Amino acid sequence: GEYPTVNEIPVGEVRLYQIADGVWSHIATQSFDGAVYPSNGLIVRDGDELLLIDTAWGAKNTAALLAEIEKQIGLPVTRAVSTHFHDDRVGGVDVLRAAGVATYASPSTRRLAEAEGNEIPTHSLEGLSSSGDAVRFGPVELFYPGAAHSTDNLVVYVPSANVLYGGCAVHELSSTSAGNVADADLAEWPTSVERIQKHYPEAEVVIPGHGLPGGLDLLQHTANVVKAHKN
């Protein structure tokens, strides 16, 4: 009943983890450049429907996600938000779009996904283009903290449960490096994390884009590992 780790999930299977009432994470694994990585997303109950945050990193993983949701929860996924343009966030959007899910991302994410050759969410989320912006989306708040892991990364807060989903701007406590920094801004990242800390001081659970949830310490730890990576 502990949170599931990379070696416990074969590539292609998806597990769900109950975070709070009406809030789950989803965990899947994928191969990239010859190594296997876990990744997280979020599911938030929206009355008799579900809001999905992020794909399960690939088409077959995302199909498996939908099946796992049907088995474990049994409510329809009606909308999905992708929190940046990388394949661990948008790979699977075409599966979602063929299963009746309306897919959303910021215009910045949509442009970057298109330029990269990744799958492209259908609908643009306006109101998020300046750092510190926040908008409501069903049962969550979407927040743009500034450039961090990527220039487009969004953060999601579930106010009913004080759950902060940091996405790939936030690392797990065991991390020793800042993950895949190919598209990152290591210089701005600590400032962006500080904006998150200031905006969401009552967060009780913090979920990283990859690895184990914890508390607010994940934010400071992230700042620490990024500053040492830049060095």
Ligand X SMILES: C[C@H](OC(=O)CCCN)c1cccc2c(-c3ccc(CS(C)(=O)=O)c(Cl)c3)c(C(=O)O)[nH]c12
Q: Decide if residue 110 touches Zn ion (CB under 5 A).
A: no
Q: Decide if residue 86 touches Zn ion (CB under 5 A).
A: yes
Site string for Zn ion, 135-174 (x = CB under 5 A): ---------------------------------x------
Tell me phi and psi for residue 72, to 5 degrees: -90, -30
For residue 3, what is the DSSP state? P
Task: Look up 84 and say whether it is catalytic.
Answer: yes
* Candidate segments 7-15, 138-146, 152-160, 174-182, binder of ligand X by CB under 6 A: 174-182
199 is an annotated ligand-binding site residue: no
Q: What angle do CA 197, 198, 202 make, to 5 degrees?
A: 70
Rg (C-alpha) for the chain, rounded Å, is 16
Q: Tell me the residue nearest to ligand X as measured from the CB.
A: 179
User: Which of 41, 146, 166, 209 lies at the binding interface for Zn ion (CB under 5 A)?
Assistant: 209
| Complex with ligand X: residue 25 or 175, whichever CB lies closer | 175
User: Which of 15, 171, 195, 221 lies at the binding interface for ligand X (CB under 6 A)?
Assistant: 171
User: Which of 13, 32, 75, 188 lies at the binding interface for ligand X (CB under 6 A)?
Assistant: 32
Strands, E, within the chain: which ranges? 14-20, 23-32, 35-46, 49-53, 77-81, 102-105, 123-124, 134-137, 140-143, 155-158, 163-167, 205-208
**Hey, is 29 helix, strand or coil?**
strand
Phi-psi label, residue 47: left if phi above 0, alpha if psi -120 to 50, beta otherwise:
left
* Candidate segments 1-9, 30-38, 78-86, 184-192, binder of Zn ion by CB under 5 A: 78-86
